[PDB]
């Protein structure tokens with residue numbers, strides 16, 4: 084007798100029937116949700132007929148783009164507190180008479196509807212604290228509410244779920260063990276002597292160590308980005324937003340490093356010195372490549388491709404062809420929508436730092452022109468399919484967040500790279516305009532004579548090379 088009698092929607096909001104006004108499924112693609120109201124999404128999230136692990140994962144990764152953590156907690160609590168449908172007139176008559184009605188439909192509602200749903204709400208809670216504990220770290224009150232809620236749950240079966248959720252919450256509160264599979268190589272130094280932080284610069288630190296420390300820094304920044312940080316947040320990447328601290332830190336780093344390489348190049352007006360700077364940056368790229376740090380490789384490429392750097396024909400004329408080949412092949416990684424890059428990424432062995440920029444590009448492509456909502460019969464439905472497509476892209480990022488580099492952190496170098504601010508107080512566009520004008524100054528366009536500039540560095544320009552000592 085499949086369909087059951089449910090409480091009315093005036094006492095239980097999840098009891099409203101499915102219609103085109105509140106839920107749409109995909110066809111020619113378990114029914115896959117294309118769109119729906121938040122109420123309908125939450126109902127299907129904790130659906131009585133079957134388990135939906137894929138929808139639970141996707142919803143919990145993407146829900147902040149259409150619903151607040153606090154609102155979500157209210158809705159699942161609401162979903163949990165199921166009223167019983169009022170007795171039928173026939174059942175109520177048996178009660179008048181002092182009799183006990185069979186209550187077949189009531190027993191069945193408890194069994195096939197109340198228990199599967201309450202259980203699925205608890206599974207959602209468990210998945211929530213395990214994979215998205217950061218929601219609770221950012222909002223202490225959210226965690227108070229969750230703890231208070233699970234503490235009111237009664238029943239033996241259910242109490243195993245409450246125990247699991249409690250266990251997780253404790254493990255997450257307690258929680259950085261670092262495991263070297265092999266013995267890390269000796270830290271490399273060049274002109275700047277260890278601890279002499281005031282002299283730290285592009286040419287004074289060892290090319291090898293710059294590349295190792297930037298790889299460690301970028302590996303940590305990449306590993307700290309949660310999938311959910313990339314959902315409904317792509318056009319405000321640079322803004323300090325509560326759902327995206329690690330996304331912001333990663334992008335800031337990439338921007339600062341790329342603009343720093345550029346600055347180091349165009350602010351070195353002496354040709355011989357500028358050639359040494361460019362050559363050193365290609366050396367850092369070589370070491371990035373041997374470290375499988377594709378994020379670093381592509382940061383060097385973006386810098387070498389920027390309008391201020393790309394036009395420096397006299398600088399690049401003095402670069403060894405072996406170095407030019409390296410940079411030329413590094414550019415080819417990005418051609419045909421990163422075709423060669425994806426081939427290398429998928430063929431190399433870990434520790435690696437995947438190029439992060441590509442995920443932002445693809446998420447932007449997926450979200451561009453993709454409606455936030457669908458409108459049916461004047462009502463609004465959340466476009467869940469848009470959220471699902473972003474989640475498929477973010478799922479890829481996770482697979483390369485599990486191997487530590489066998490490399491020793493150098494605290495002073497690390498701090499130097501963490502504190503890079505090439506822009507000063509300038510905005511990016513204006514700074515790049517300034518860099519472009521500096522490019523014109525150091526290498527005037529054809530009619531104009533090539534001026535010769537004073538040296539700004541008094542230390543050897545010769546590189547120690549990319550081979551360990």
Ligand SMILES: COc1cc2nc(C)nc(N[C@H](C)c3cc(N)cc(C(F)(F)F)c3)c2cc1O[C@H]1CCOC1
Pocket residue numbers: 384387388389392393394399402406407408410411412413414415
């Ligand atoms: C059709 O566009 C492009 C084709 C390119 N093809 C290749 C083989 N490499 C490129 N760049 C590498 C990173 C490079 C840069 C510099 N500065 C010097 C070298 C070299 F080693 F050769 F000297 C190599 C290219 C950049 C392109 O376009 C960019 C610049 C304008 O806007 C977008």
